[model samples]
Target: ASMEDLQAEARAFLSEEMIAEFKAAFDMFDADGGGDISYKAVGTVFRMLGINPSKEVLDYLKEKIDVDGSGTIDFEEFLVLMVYSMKQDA
Candidate 1:
């Protein structure tokens, strides 16, 4: 789906505040304003969240979330990863 469509779909399940929080989080890593978060920034965000993942863990997450092999995570990718994680917890 397009980013707009994905955003709309996300809103269907997430609250306005939750959406804003995710946007804010994404903006923090979207340093180039290229509309995506680079793999490097993914590490930054994870560290900021106290995740401190090992190289193996990082590679695994990138493998699952970087769907296009573009070395970046778009909003859709981020959302998908989030949902996938939620499902995992269930």
Candidate 2:
């Protein structure tokens, strides 16, 4: 009843299965398992899922995802990226 609960509501286009996959992907790279992931991991997985966001694109979006300049992606931060990915026609 944490991020998943909220994510389903916020990004309805993502099915339960899709959300689960996203979590697994995030967890795979979260390395530290501290509920967050580095920007590098994000880019790696970002393209791993069939979306090719160029370096410049990620660098620019990194500013938004990093939010507090934390240099990592919090749960919701990653969710925002998923939402954006799903939003595209690609």
Clashing pairs in 2: none
lDDT of 2 at 11: 67
Write one digit per residue (lDDT tens) for candidate 1, span 46-68. Answer: 55554345454367666755664
**Backbone collision count in every prediction?**
0, 0
Per-candidate Cα lDDT values, in order, are: 0.58, 0.64
> How well does candidate 2 score on lDDT at residue 12?
73
Model 2, span 1-90: residue lDDT tens: 344664665467676677677677788777688778776666667767766664444765667556644367766666655565445435
| TM-score of every prediction relative to native | 0.52, 0.60
Runs in model 2 deviating more than 4 A are: 1-10, 54-57, 61-70
State the local distance difference test value for candidate 1: 0.58
Local lDDT at 36 for model 1: 90
